[PDB]
Each structure stands twice: as C-alpha cells, then as structure tokens.
Design an enzyme around this catalytic site. Sequence first.
Site, short mmCIF file in Angstrom:
data_model
loop_
_atom_site.label_atom_id
_atom_site.label_comp_id
_atom_site.label_asym_id
_atom_site.label_seq_id
_atom_site.Cartn_x
_atom_site.Cartn_y
_atom_site.Cartn_z
N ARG A 137 0.83 -1.20 0.00
CA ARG A 137 0.00 0.00 0.00
C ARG A 137 0.87 1.25 0.00
O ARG A 137 1.81 1.37 0.79
CB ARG A 137 -0.95 0.01 1.20
CG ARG A 137 -2.00 1.14 1.17
CD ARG A 137 -2.57 1.40 2.56
NE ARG A 137 -3.42 2.59 2.61
CZ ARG A 137 -3.57 3.36 3.68
NH1 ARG A 137 -2.92 3.11 4.81
NH2 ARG A 137 -4.38 4.42 3.63
N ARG A 146 -10.87 21.59 5.21
CA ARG A 146 -9.85 22.17 6.09
C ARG A 146 -10.24 23.57 6.55
O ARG A 146 -10.97 24.28 5.86
CB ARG A 146 -8.48 22.22 5.39
CG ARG A 146 -8.07 20.94 4.64
CD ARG A 146 -7.82 19.75 5.57
NE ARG A 146 -6.52 19.81 6.23
CZ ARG A 146 -5.96 18.79 6.89
NH1 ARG A 146 -6.58 17.62 6.98
NH2 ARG A 146 -4.77 18.94 7.45
N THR A 151 -6.81 -0.35 9.48
CA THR A 151 -6.40 0.67 10.47
C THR A 151 -6.42 0.27 11.94
O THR A 151 -7.38 -0.33 12.42
CB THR A 151 -7.11 2.05 10.27
OG1 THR A 151 -8.51 1.94 10.55
CG2 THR A 151 -6.91 2.58 8.84
N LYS A 170 -13.51 2.90 -0.26
CA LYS A 170 -13.36 3.07 1.18
C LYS A 170 -14.61 3.72 1.77
O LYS A 170 -14.95 4.85 1.41
CB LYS A 170 -12.14 3.93 1.50
CG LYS A 170 -10.79 3.28 1.18
CD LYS A 170 -9.67 4.32 1.03
CE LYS A 170 -9.27 4.94 2.37
NZ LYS A 170 -8.30 6.07 2.19
#
Lengths: 518, 518, 518
Positions: free
Chosen positions: B60, B107, B315, B257
Amino acid sequence: QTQQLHAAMADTFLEHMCRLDIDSPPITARNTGIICTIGPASRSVETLKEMIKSGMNVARLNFSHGTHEYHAETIKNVRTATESFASDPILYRPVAVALDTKGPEIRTGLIKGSGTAEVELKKGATLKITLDNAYMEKCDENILWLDYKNICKVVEVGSKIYVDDGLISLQVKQKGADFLVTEVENGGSLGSKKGVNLPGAAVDLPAVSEKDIQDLKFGVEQDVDMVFASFIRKASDVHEVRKVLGEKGKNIKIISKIENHEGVRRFDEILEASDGIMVARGDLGIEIPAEKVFLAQKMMIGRCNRAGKPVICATQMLESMIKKPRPTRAEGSDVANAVLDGADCIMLSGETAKGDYPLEAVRMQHLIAREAEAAIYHLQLFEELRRLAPITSDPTEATAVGAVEASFKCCSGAIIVLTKSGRSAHQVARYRPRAPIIAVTRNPQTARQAHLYRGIFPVLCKDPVQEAWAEDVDLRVNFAMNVGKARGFFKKGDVVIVLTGWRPGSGFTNTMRVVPVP
Amino acid sequence: QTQQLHAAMADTFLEHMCRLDIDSPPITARNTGIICTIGPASRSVETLKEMIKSGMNVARLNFSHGTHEYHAETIKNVRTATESFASDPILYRPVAVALDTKGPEIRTGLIKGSGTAEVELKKGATLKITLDNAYMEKCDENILWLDYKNICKVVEVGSKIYVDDGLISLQVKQKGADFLVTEVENGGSLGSKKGVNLPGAAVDLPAVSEKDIQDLKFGVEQDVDMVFASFIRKASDVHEVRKVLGEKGKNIKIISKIENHEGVRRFDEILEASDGIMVARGDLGIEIPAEKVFLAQKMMIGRCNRAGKPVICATQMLESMIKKPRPTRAEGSDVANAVLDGADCIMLSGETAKGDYPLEAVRMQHLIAREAEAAIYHLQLFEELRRLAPITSDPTEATAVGAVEASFKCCSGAIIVLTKSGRSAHQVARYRPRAPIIAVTRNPQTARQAHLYRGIFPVLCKDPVQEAWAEDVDLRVNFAMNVGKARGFFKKGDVVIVLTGWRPGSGFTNTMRVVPVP
Amino acid sequence: QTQQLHAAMADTFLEHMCRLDIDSPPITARNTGIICTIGPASRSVETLKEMIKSGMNVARLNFSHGTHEYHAETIKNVRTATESFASDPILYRPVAVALDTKGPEIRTGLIKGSGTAEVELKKGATLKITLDNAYMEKCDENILWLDYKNICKVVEVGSKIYVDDGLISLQVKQKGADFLVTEVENGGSLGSKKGVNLPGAAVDLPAVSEKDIQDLKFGVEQDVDMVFASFIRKASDVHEVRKVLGEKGKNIKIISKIENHEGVRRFDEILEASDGIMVARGDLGIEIPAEKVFLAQKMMIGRCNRAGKPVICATQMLESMIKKPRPTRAEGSDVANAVLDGADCIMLSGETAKGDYPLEAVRMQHLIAREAEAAIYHLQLFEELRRLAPITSDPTEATAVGAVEASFKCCSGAIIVLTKSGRSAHQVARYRPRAPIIAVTRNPQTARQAHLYRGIFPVLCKDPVQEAWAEDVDLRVNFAMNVGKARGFFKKGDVVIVLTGWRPGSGFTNTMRVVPVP
C-alpha cells in the site's frame, strides 16, 4: 414454476409443505423403481410389452406357487418382451428378473379327513396343540397339529399364536415337551393346512428350506439378477443364502425380507450383510401389531438411506386396483409417502399378478412416484445425507458428491455416469439428486441390477470397444445424450453433469464435467 | 486432531466454540491476504526482502503525503525485492502494488499567520462559523472559517461539527446565510488548517480532486494493480474514478473506502459499482460513534461475502506494535475476529510504514490468520453461502461449488485451478473452502491481483505454451503439485482437487478432477 | 427500527450480519457487567461516585501490590460512595466488592547485588539454572537462581523457560538434581526479581501461598462478594480456596482465573468446582502462543454459557486509554466481540487503576456493550442453548425457559424476577434473553453478586416485609416497575414478564405472569 421448485426454496419444512402446488407440473423422468410381480394376469408377451411401456423396471416371480416350467416360461416371456425393444438401443429399457423365495413357513393339518373342512371355535375356549404326527390327517376344535417340531422350545407360557394370517389368536397356558395347552383369544372359521405365526419369538427354522435350495439353483441357471430372501431374521440367515448361491451365483444381489419382530430387532446386522432390503409389510403386520408397521417402514427406509443400500416398499400399496380401475385415496397417499420417506423401489403383488387392471396399476404407480419426487425437500435431505456420511480418502466418493452438488446448483437435466460394476452410479444415487442419473454400461447384468437404486436410469451400450480411451468415453457419453433427448429428459442447450474415469475402469471415476447438450 | 477438525464437525455453533482447542495445530497454508503500507520504516530493499519472507501480499502506497517521485522509487523497490526471488518459479511469490488516494477533505483557515501558535477553546462557549473569505488568516476562538462553500445547505439547526480528527465537538443553534451560531460540546487544543468532519450529512464534495487525477494517472503509467478510492458515498463516485482510469486502466481494481454515515446507508449501490470494499475504520470512527464501528464492519463484510467481492479490514489493527515488539490482547482478538467475520484481507497502516517493528508485525498478522482460519465454522458458512446464491445456468459456477464440496469431502490438501483472468479462482474463493486455492496462471497481473481474494495462493508459470492442449494442462498442473509440496501444503499420496478447461481458451472451466499427488 | 430487530428476524447468520444497522439505536438497558480495578487513579471518593454514574458494577482489588490498610481504605471509600445514592432506592445501584489474589509465583534472585542491575543475554549463549541459596544475590550472565525448588521435577529435557513476562526464552538441554543447563532462545534485558513462566508444565506450587491465605481471611471479615482466585490449574485448587474461606465465607463466590496451558487443559473440572471463570488473557498470552488466546477465550466463554456460569474477559481491553482519552479501533472490536462471544462480564485493569482517563474508559465499556447486545443473533443463541441443556424436572428451571420464550414472543420490556437467593434470576440469565432481567431482592449480598450475570439488573428492596403474602409480592413487583420506568427501560402500557412463587414459602419460582406496565 415447475417440479415444485418454489417449495424447494423454503428454509422451513412447514413452509415447504405450505408451498406444495398442484399446478406445478413435474418433469418427465421418474426416479423410483417399480417392481411388478408376474402371474396369470400379466404373463403373456403382449401384456409384458405394454407393461414395460407403462414403466415396469423389475419383474418379480413369487415362488410360493407355480412349478419351474411355469416360471421358466414367464422368464422366457419377460425376455421376449424385453428384447423386442432391442432393435433401437436408444429406446431400450433393461428389465431385471427377481426371484422371491417361499422361505420357511409353518402349516397345520387336515380337519376330519378332508382338506376343505372348516371347524368354528368359540371365543374364550381351550385348545391343545400337538406335535403328534398321528393327528396329521384329522384335526379338531380340541386338537390341532402343526409341522414345526421345535414350537415348545421357542414359545413360553403367556405367548401368542396366530393362525391363518392372524385370524385366530391363541395364548399359551401350559408348556411341555411335545404339546401346548392353549386358550383362544380371537377365534373364527378354522380350516386345513393354514399358516402359523409366532409373534416376538426367536424361531429356529432353517434360513433356507428344502424347496428354497432347489429354487435358488433354478435362479442361478436361469440368470436372475436378484433374490428376495424370505423370513430373514439374523446375519447368519443372509450368509446362508450367500453360501448356497456360492461361486456361480456370487454376482446375484440378495435382498433381505424383514417380516417379523426379530428381523426388525437385528436389522443392523442383516443390512450390513445384505445388498438391500425389502419392507414386507404384509407378513410384518401379522407378526407385529398393524399400527406399528409404519414405524418399521420409516426406520428401515431411514437406515438403508443412511447405509446407501437399496430399499423396497411392498404389498397392498394399490390393493383395491385388483378389482377396480382406480385406487383409493389411502393408496394414493401410501405410494407418495413411500417415495417421500426414501424408498428406492415400490412394488405391486396381485395388483399386477392376478388382478383385473395390471397396466393401470403400473401407470398409477408411475404418475404418483413422479409427483412425489418433486415434492421431496431436497434441501434438508442433501444436507443431512452429506453430513452423516464420513470424510473419506476415496476419490470416487469425493467425485460423487461434487457431481450432486453441481447438479443442484445448475438444476441439471441429468447426471451421466460411465460405470461397469454400477458402483459409480450407486455412489451418486446415495446423495439423492433431483436430476435423473443416466448410467451408461456395457454390462447387461449391471444394467438390470441398477433398477434397485433411485435415480439410476440405466442404458446398455452395444457399440464395440474402441482402442483410444478418450474416444470410447465420448462414444458412450454421446449415446447418453441421445437417450435424454429421445426420452425428453433434456434438449439441446441444457446443462448436464458427466462422470468419467481416467483409465479404463473400474473404480477410477474421478472426473466431473459440466457440459451443454450437443 | 489438527486445524480444529473436532470443532468443525459440531452440529451447533455453541459446541463449535466449546471444542476450540489450543492444542490443535493449524496447517501451514495461510489464506487471508496481508496488505502492508510502505513508509520510512519499510522503504529499504533489505527490509522488503524479509517482508516477503514473512507474508506480505499487497504493498500500500498512501498518497496523502509524498510527491510522485517519492512513491515512484517505492514501486521500483518492491519490484526489485520481488524479482530477487524470481530465480526459482517454484518458490516465487507475486507481490501486488496498491494506491490509496487522498480524496476530498474539508480544512480550516490559518491562525495568526504561521501555523505553529496554539489556540484554546472552552466547553460551553459559543463560536461562529463564517463563509466570508476575509477570515482565512484570522481565525479566532470567537470566529471560524472553513473552505467548504456548501456547509449551510447540508447542516440543519442542531447538527454536529468535528474539528481535528474528532477532538472538538460543535452543536449548531442558529441557521443563516453565511453564519451559524454554534455552541461547544468538547473543546480543547486548536491548531491550524485542521481536519473537519461532517457526521450524518450528505456532503456534495467532488468525488476526486485534481490532485487525485494526477495520482490515478501516475498509477496507470506505473502499472499498479489496484486503487483504494477514498471517501466514497454514492455509486456515481465510483463511476468517476473509473472515468479517470479509462480504457488504459480497465484492469486496475477499484476498492471503495467507506468512511461516513451516507456511505453506509447507500452501501449496496457502491459495492455494485466497486470491484471491492475497504472498511476504513480509522476515518469511520471519527464520523460515526466509535462503538458503532464493529456493526458497520460486520455489515460490510457480510454483504461482500454474499456478493462475492473482496473486503479489507483496516487501520489500528496492531496499534501497540508501533513501539512495542509484541501486541496487546485486544489487537490479537481484532485480527482473529476480522478473519472470523469473513474478511478477505487485513492491513497495517503505520505498523509497517513508521513503526519500530515492521518486520514482526506481518509475522504476528500471519500467525493469527492461520489460527482463525481453522476456527471458522465451515459447516454453517458453506451451507449459508450456497443457498443464498441462486440457481445458475453458468457451467463454471456449478464447477466451482462441486469442487468446494469435493474439497470438504476428501479433506483436500488443495484446490488447483488453471486460470487466465483469475475468474475461475474467484468463483472457488467466494464459497470459502478451507483447502488452499492454488491458482496457476501465465498472466503476471492475474497472479498479483488474486491476493485480493481469500485462500488464493497465486503462482506464475514461466514455462512456454506447449503445442498440444493436454500437455500444457499437465505441465501446469504438475507445476502446482511441485509448488504445494515445496511450501508444505501437502505431500506425495495426498488427494487434491484439479480445475481445468476443455480447450485452450479462457473462461470455460468445467472439468473437476480428484487426483493423488505424484 | 430499534435494537437490530430487522437483523434478529434473519433466517441465516450471514444475513443477520448484512442487516446490522448503525442507525438502529439500542435499548436503554445494558446487560454486560463491568468490573473496574480500583487504584491510585480511582481511589478518591469523588472519582468513585462518578464511576458508579458511568456504570461500574464491581470493584476489583489487586493484591499483587499494596498492604491491608491501603485496600481497607479503598473498600471504605467504595462502600461510602455506593451509599451516596442509598437515599432513593429507585436509582440505587448495588456495587460489588472483588478481591483478586497474588497467587503463587516464581521469582529470580538479585543480579550483581543491587536491585536495578542490567545483564544482556546472547541468543544461542549458555545459561545455568540453580536452586543453591548461596547464589541468591550474585546472579550473573552465567548463573541464575529461582525460588521454586521443585523446578527440576516438573521440567523435562527440551522444555521452555520464560523470564520476565515472556521476554526471555530458554530451552533446557541438561537435566539434574537441582540444576538445569539452558540454551538462550531469545534474551535481552535481564534483571532482579523477575517472574518465571512454565509453558506446557504441571506447576506443583501450593494452590494458595502464605500471603494468599491471610488475604482471603482479610476478605471474609472485610465482607467481600467474590474472589478472583489466581493461577488455578486443577479442581483441587478450587477446593483449597473454598477450604480457606470455610463456613464464615461459604457464600463468597469463587471466580477461577485460568492463566496457563494446564488450566485450559483441565478447564472442565475447574468450571464444575468454581462459581465463575476469568479468562486471564494477560498471563495466558505469556504461557501460550499469543496468537492462540482467542481460541481459549471462545472455548471458555462457550463452555460457561453451556454450563450457565459467570465468565469474565480481562486485560488490555482498552489499553491505549491509559494515556489517551479514546480507544483504538482494535480495542472497540475486542469489547464488542467479547460480548458477542457470550461473555458475562468485561473488565479494566490499569485503565481505571493507573490511567489518566478512567471515567472515559468505563463510559466506553458501557457504550460498546449495549450496542453489541442488540447485534446478538438471539434466534440461534436461544435455540442452541435450550437444545444443549438437558431435560429437567426442576420447576424453577422450567419456568425460566418459558419466561425467556415469552419474552421473545411479546418482545417484553423486561423480565421481573423476585428472588431471595438469586438462583431464579441466574436460571433466566443463562438462556440469554434480549430483555433486561430486574432481580428484586431484600438481600444485599444477593444484590451485589447478581452483577456477575448478563442481563440481571439488580435492585435492593428496602421496604419492610408485609404480613400478608399477596401484599408483599405486588409491593416488590411495583417497586421494580417504578425502577424500570424511571431508568427508561419501559413505559406504561408496555408488556413485561413477572417471575414469582405461588405459595407463601414452599420455595420455587414457579409462576410466570404476562402483565402490562401500570
């Protein structure tokens, strides 16, 4: 949908029942074998020709009556009728010949000189049984003679004695050496030389009578496919039949007839010694209380399925059709429930042997079996059969399940199996697919003996054996494709399963192919 | 017994749990693919050589940081390490390259010019959200700016806003044009241009940014094997990534995802367009309540097994091994249970990228997988997968199940599949056999891409194609036999399942064989 | 919908997973008990008040460290914090006290004289074990001393020796009378007074040490509710603990901590003897390969569910919460899977003892539990548990199964059980209802010890006993009704199951009533 596939997709047996649909038509193939007993009503070649057309798979000859000449002509007549379709090997249906023995029985004597004299005995009276051969010619309502000289050795005080197919019932009050003092429980019109049954008794009669020996030889020389062995009640009985058939009869299949208490008790040892079983409900219901027969049927069918050995349900299945053109509702129910329990074969005895509608009985048998085969809950059955079967190192067995699993996944038109001994087809049939099993063989005897197994639709190949292995396979596979198409089991484009060996037999069946029909 | 075979035969899930035995050793063959993230700790060529020896399958490359040239040397390094083993095709192990995009992200603005100064925010205080671009460099503890233009259209009066990976919780009290009066529910440390999250809101950000376009195009030209598409919430998002890949990226697999409330609610349509799914637990836990994550994880794995498409558990798997040389007990439980849920792949983000212990992290991952694979309740799993899957007319699908069933019946040492595109192997894997699937291919990408599916052991045949079909089959089958023996999956005498075609084509796999190892 | 009722109706486990909805909120009640290790971080009363508010049910005390005055003060604070809620018996949460023993242990001697002294150790280098008490304080890189003098009697040639929580691996090459010549398999930083573990060995240390006997006696007079008995490896160990507790402490429940290969291997006899079980994962993972712990965990949980005895899952559940305010993904899954496995109680060791965030860990423990409880596949769990439990003649047992069945049928708000000893509520809890079991008891010890069981929400009834029987039943019943309404388990009009006796005092909880909430 068709063939009860909506019901098949239920996750619950109750719901499977709720979904059973009379408007869902079955497919054309019928998996359950049909044994027909041959007699005066169906003996001719003309009738047998029409009887094969109606769906007879196995001819049964009952050796309780008839001479050897009579039976030999019947076998000649079956063969003439069977081989009359041989001209086109595409449409040729092999027909098995089954010899059903008389077995050991117990008879009485004549009443007051003559053999047609009847003497009534009241309910509750007393009666003496004797082994004294002086009373052979004149029995009485006081004294009765039977030809079984160990009767006191096996029957205690308080035991019952059924006379004339369970008409008269008799409790034993006194034992002894050569006599029994008895009280009548039932009663009725007592005649001459009638049948005697001892419920719950360990009868020590020989496995095979003097007549049986002769008849078993007769079967060997007449090239019969199977023997239905009467009154089997222990493993040593089966072995006795095995030893009597000896070397010359080693390939003949022995079907043990369970028709008494002891047979049921020692069922597990009888089955492992036998090639298959027959639930002989007629005599069973005389030996055990009639209301327990279904329990024995379901137990015996259960275990034969678990052991992967053929079972036959027999007697009175379509009884009223002896006299009438259509069966009772009870009879329709009976045939359908035999199939649903898991019977490989169902039988007619008298319905086709002596009765007025032999053809209609065979036809009705065919129609119901077919309907009942679709009505099976294959989902539960396959899961149960595959998990109750042990893990094995046998590649043929692993190939067998693979074929059946695949069969269900693609709703296959057929499972084609190349086999010489029949084993490869038997191993598939054990797992009970919906799909018919077209079993191609060059062995005529194997083809006939295959009828004992549900699903196996045997076909006999005439084509000469070829040099290249791949070509000999294709020749036989294509022949099977030509059978399915001709009989309407499948058409061009349909999907089938094909089982072949890697080298020329037998027991090398390790190849499954999923192929479209050419 | 070995590989938990005593638990395997329990008729009940509870008894299966009771039979789990720490003294029952697993097979050597490991089924669950391991994806490693490559960073500062595992970038070395010396490290990658030993990581292949440990059990790395997929590399990955996180495109959240690092320029194209930075990751360009990474791909070259993995390919160098892999080809070192290519000297012996029997021992050679294919290693796939993945690409994880950055995706759309919200952001905030800078505070006091330089992004180093710290800001404090109290709980219970108020804070305004403004859209005015004159507050970019002047974000206070009384006023806040973020680069998401459509934040007012999706947020109702009462919704939550998260700042810096879920540290600061904010609840809206006022609706307006550019302003939203918001009360603080968490508060604390407030940095510069930090990550903003919108829970339970259908965010209409573009599926891919111009940065993502250049990464995807770079992937195509570097011949990568798969893409981990970030932040997918609808079916159109997946079509958008496919548009960028285009005809020249037709073979590269898209892994969507899932990491927000909308993506979960509209998961069905996503999986439909996707080649695979990744359960992005890290980002997901920030979006949805962290105690609800196991629910989404299991929901998604379930649906991916049912659809027969690869799924990755992701994760914080072995979180502690980022510093320590051994995992915590919770981490061991996590790896095992993901495998027990049915995850084709598990992965390490940082453990192999940054951590002090990257080499052993794969080893622990590899050790747990084998143990958990044995502990799967195959009897339930298989029967449920094969009945949720419908009746097919496709011969290859029927071949696949038969092989899997046969696999269980003879407890096969492996299922050997001669495949070209991988589709044949993929059809076996979706039925989750315990027996390792040895996929023999000449296609190098087919080999690498096959690591996405559970239990597929890919092997690349370097032999030239033989002039005759049968000979090229044997050569390739015998190659698999040599591989399985050398890796200790089985030995001479053991029984294996062989899947081949009938003609030198591609898709039509129809022949299943049960053969002993020579 | 709520509490995964859509998933609960799935006819298959794979579909049950596919139906798990993150937007389906759980019921307000939580069934999994929570044990917390009280220590320096949670010793203060103000902190203990908020821990009962977060939902702590049992207070663990670790007697590996600290003195009797340290722990008596810890119990004093715990009890006075519990009583700060005693004024309103509707909201009063009973809190159990738990004593966890040090157990027997093997320790190394002092290195080079000093306490903190470092000795490095090469892999492959030679090392000598000795029991010579002269070496006690001069342990070198060549000589090592242990206080377990039966060491040579329990270790054969080739056995492993772990030193300091499995950091150092040693293999035994030479045997002897009181010496072992070991080869270093791992090694690293070796120091003084470090624990030694014996993998695959029958350690013959006493069941309770000289310190442990005094600690248990201390517990009896301090009036604890349970004992977590360390290092139980056989049934005889549990009797020894029972023998020490004697008549004065015959009611105190013994929870056996399984922490080695022999404890696992002889688990059946231990469970029979014990009242409960603790999967001590920390010490287990040192004794047995770390990848094998989940196997043992599920084994023990399954067996305890099959036996209907409490079970506790322990160590490193939320290990990252010692230093951080949020758990990792692998940790959140650990808790969930422990609940789904069927664990009665979950605990926190060090997370609530030494950590900076103790309250947050307890709230997390509480949140994951309630979510994971709804995701249980109750259709499978109930029908397996009822099938695996043998037919009884005990009415108290028969009423519980029926009451649980009734609960699933009417989707009951709760099952209210009036029980003096707690036995009745225990019998309901073993069949894992989805509905919370409100155990109404006047016995404070019954109230506290109830927390060891899944589902049982205990309530201590303080009202005086009323003279007439009919008055007293309804008084306790309506009390539980008020509890349920106030805590939010159900509203007026909802359906509840009520379990009581019929006769005043002939024992037996034999009456099941289905009633609306008034």
